[PDB]
Symmetry: C3
């Protein structure tokens, strides 16, 4: 099966199985392992790997999409001695996660979000982009091949294609999404299409 | 099955199944979905995802290769009201495509060509490279980790490794492939080898 | 089966099957083809593709890990006339390889090491990184999205995130890993965790 529990390890005494909303579509050629929650109307495409086997949940909110070849994984959040590694945990609305992906988020083809990380609602994570040890705000756009490592990206900003942002001073001066910006409506269009694709693929299973 | 029709959606009233030349080899661990035409002697490697589920064909010409982890997909080409979205369609020799990959093209490991896009004959798209909203001419080389977004790359030019080209003014001044250039013969060698690999893999199926 | 022989080709008269230590874990959704040797306690994750079908071995040393979406492949090492192509072969401790990955090496998610290439022991190859026609020394760190093409990286150096190193003069001046460097202990932690994950996954098969 391609939806599987994580294994018993010294960091993980009890296996967990994914919790997947019945309206989500998981492609048979995707892999989803371990302590993962997938929300309503989410589409998970071929060759995506969502793997939560080092402690703490990976959460994917409602109406989000995880496109072909995307990887979600996280650094260990509990060491062998049972002690939580706080640097590797993100907090969102009072709850702790290894990776938090909000609602209406698009993780486009071949991107990767590696914990600890949080991605706020209505954000587009572009093709081949990379997010690690970062909090990306709501209504952001990471253009293709951009990256955010070790930073907080404020709400409503974009990272131009190819730019690798590693310092908070850079992140603070990113440009704002405006109506005339080329990707200002991209996420809404991609979310709308993927919610409908998920329903269509569900009707073929 | 890993060769599948696309689903019924408001953008797609009729499912299409891939049209695959009998001399092509599709690895069992690749995925090919929807309105896709694959030409003669094409090799499609493990973990590639070719997904045409938003309207309009993805075409892969003869003696081309789609290597491991490559993704081909396209933006919607027909909106819900049945109206063709012309910005998201490319025209090649009088016919419309979402993605057109010409003959003798190598899409090397982990690259991605996302529609609307066209790639001309005898072009090497290097490892981890990215092409989106662009027309790449014939006899071009995209070195590893290069990208072309929103531009036309003239025939016979190369993009140096890691360079992300987003403006026509940059694309117009790219260097020319010459006989002494390090990748001048790379594509021909890779095509020759892959045509023979496709035949060898076909003999094991 | 996902562990397979390579095909007969003019460059390869005799098919080879992978040699895999009994303590290694190969995920059912990984692909391993051809002349590959995998050492003890190695973990190969979903969607990785290790493909040795153009001559010469791909070797992965003990306690190394090949994470999700990683690709290992190599340029042809024997031409049709049976003549070895020496430029495409690396030598390590008196033996020839297409790709050599040493012991305790982490190939992190979505990275790629393409032959000819060698990666020395205790080196971290970061997420989405790329190594081609290069020798990476021991105790190195390639940060996420870095690349080494056509160079030798001296022992104990790191490449900052996003940097693409293509000239020996650049490689010679890379910074040194020190105890205070942010990734100085990353590989040891990742190796330790993955050796335990491999054992846990083996207990579920
Ligand atoms: Zn990881
Ligand atoms: Zn797409
Ligand atoms: Zn290759």
């Amino acid at each position: 099966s391609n939806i599987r529990e994580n294994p018993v390890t010294p960091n993980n005494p009890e296996p967990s199985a994914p919790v997947i909303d019945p309206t989500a579509y998981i492609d048979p050629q995707a892999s989803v392992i371990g302590e993962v929650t997938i929300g309503a109307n989410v589409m998970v495409s071929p060759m995506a790997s969502i793997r939560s086997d080092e402690g703490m949940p990976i959460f994917v909110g409602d109406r989000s999409n995880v496109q072909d070849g995307v990887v979600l994984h996280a650094l260990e959040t509990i060491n062998e001695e049972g002690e939580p590694i706080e640097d590797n945990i993100v907090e969102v609305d009072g709850k702790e996660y290894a990776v938090y992906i909000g609602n209406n988020v698009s993780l486009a083809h071949q991107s990767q979000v590696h914990g600890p990380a949080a991605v706020g609602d209505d954000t587009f994570i572009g093709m081949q982009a990379f997010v690690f040890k970062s909090k990306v705000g709501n209504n952001c756009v990471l253009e293709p091949r951009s990256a955010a490592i070790g930073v907080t990206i404020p709400d409503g900003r974009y990272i131009p294609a190819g730019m690798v942002v590693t310092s908070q001073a850079e992140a603070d001066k990113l440009p704002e999404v405006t109506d005339d910006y080329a990707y200002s409506h991209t996420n809404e269009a991609v979310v709308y299409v993927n919610v409908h694709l998920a329903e269509g693929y569900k009707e073929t299973s």
